[PDB]
């Protein structure tokens, strides 16, 4: 809840700005998030989490049709209740 300044580097998470746009790097944990001026989240993520990380950005497999596997595990046709 405490507002901190920026940059910031605690716990292996460097919270920097790159190219006028904000970045949150976690290379120890395997991810690089960022946001632009308009607001457009982006998540670059390593191959260590292949057919793993299940969430709102889907699993990191090769296929693109099966990547709505709900928190139970259910291939749903709807992109919304997922």
């Amino acid at each position: 809840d405490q507002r901190v300044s920026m940059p910031y580097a605690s716990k292996g998470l460097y919270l920097e700005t790159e190219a006028g746009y904000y970045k949150l790097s976690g290379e120890a944990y395997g991810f690089v998030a960022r946001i632009d001026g308009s607001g457009n989240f982006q998540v670059l993520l390593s191959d260590r989490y292949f057919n793993k990380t299940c969430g709102l950005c889907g699993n990191f497999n090769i296929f693109a049709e099966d990547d709505f596997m709900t928190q139970e595990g259910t291939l749903t046709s709807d992109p919304y209740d997922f």
């Binding site: 790159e18 190219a19 006028g20 746009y21 001026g37 457009n40």
Partner: protein, 83 residues
């Protein structure tokens, strides 16, 4: 979005915003380049090279000179000191 999704695949595209009549928003002094290095040579920096072999990233940056100093582009002649 379509620009970046092709860039990530290993094939970048160039100058598409010249005629598209839409440039992404950025603060004053900078506008949207394409494939600028992340290791922006700023003012209070150490002149070291060939450690930043990182990949190339899109985003807005300063003009050819006009080094960065605290979130604004300022001319290289007026580089301050710090104490």
């Amino acid at each position: 979005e379509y620009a970046r999704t092709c860039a990530q695949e290993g094939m970048v595209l160039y100058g598409w915003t010249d005629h598209s009549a839409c440039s992404p928003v950025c603060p004053a002094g900078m506008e949207y380049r394409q494939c600028v290095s992340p290791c922006a040579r700023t003012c209070q920096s150490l002149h070291i090279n060939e450690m930043c072999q990182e990949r190339c990233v899109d985003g807005c940056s300063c003009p050819e000179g006009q080094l960065l100093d605290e979130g604004l582009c300022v001319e290289s002649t007026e580089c301050p000191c710090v104490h």
